[PDB]
Amino acid sequence: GGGSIKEITETTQLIVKHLAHNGEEYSEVVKEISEEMEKKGLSKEQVILLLIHFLLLSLVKGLSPETTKLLMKELIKELEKI
């Protein structure tokens, strides 16, 4: 439901640090993206969904950390409208 998402965030950072040559640059994106999700009041379930969405953009689709950050920011905005 709600609460802190730092545990979910730190796990995602560690996941992407391990599976990407530029994992550190992705981890910083996870940090900035997670703080925006907790700012926008998104639920834990939305955070996990979006963090897994970030993992698939970065690690599966091969999108740069800057690209994924832009897409995650636009997805967070779309979520707060609903």
Side-chain angles (χ1 to χ4, degrees), residues 27-65:
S27 171
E28 177 62 42
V29 169
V30 181
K31 220 187 302 291
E32 185 184 0
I33 264 57
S34 179
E35 67 188 21
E36 176 168 338
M37 305 189 67
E38 198 156 29
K39 169 189 181 303
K40 270 62 181 298
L42 300 186
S43 65
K44 260 185 180 299
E45 289 77 24
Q46 289 180 306
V47 171
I48 295 185
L49 282 178
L50 258 64
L51 285 185
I52 298 174
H53 171 243
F54 170 86
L55 288 179
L56 301 182
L57 292 170
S58 51
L59 303 182
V60 175
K61 251 198 176 311
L63 273 45
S64 59

Side-chain angles (χ1 to χ4, degrees), residues 6-39:
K6 197 64 224 176
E7 162 185 289
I8 310 177
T9 299
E10 275 275 38
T11 303
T12 308
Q13 294 175 125
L14 265 55
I15 287 173
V16 79
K17 281 175 189 172
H18 290 358
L19 303 190
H21 60 76
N22 45 356
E24 278 297 331
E25 295 187 334
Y26 285 117
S27 171
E28 177 62 42
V29 169
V30 181
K31 220 187 302 291
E32 185 184 0
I33 264 57
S34 179
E35 67 188 21
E36 176 168 338
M37 305 189 67
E38 198 156 29
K39 169 189 181 303

Side-chain angles (χ1 to χ4, degrees), residues 53 57 63 66-76:
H53 171 243
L57 292 170
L63 273 45
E66 183 74 19
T67 292
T68 64
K69 169 189 51 55
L70 291 176
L71 298 180
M72 296 303 302
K73 276 178 163 294
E74 283 294 328
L75 203 67
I76 293 164

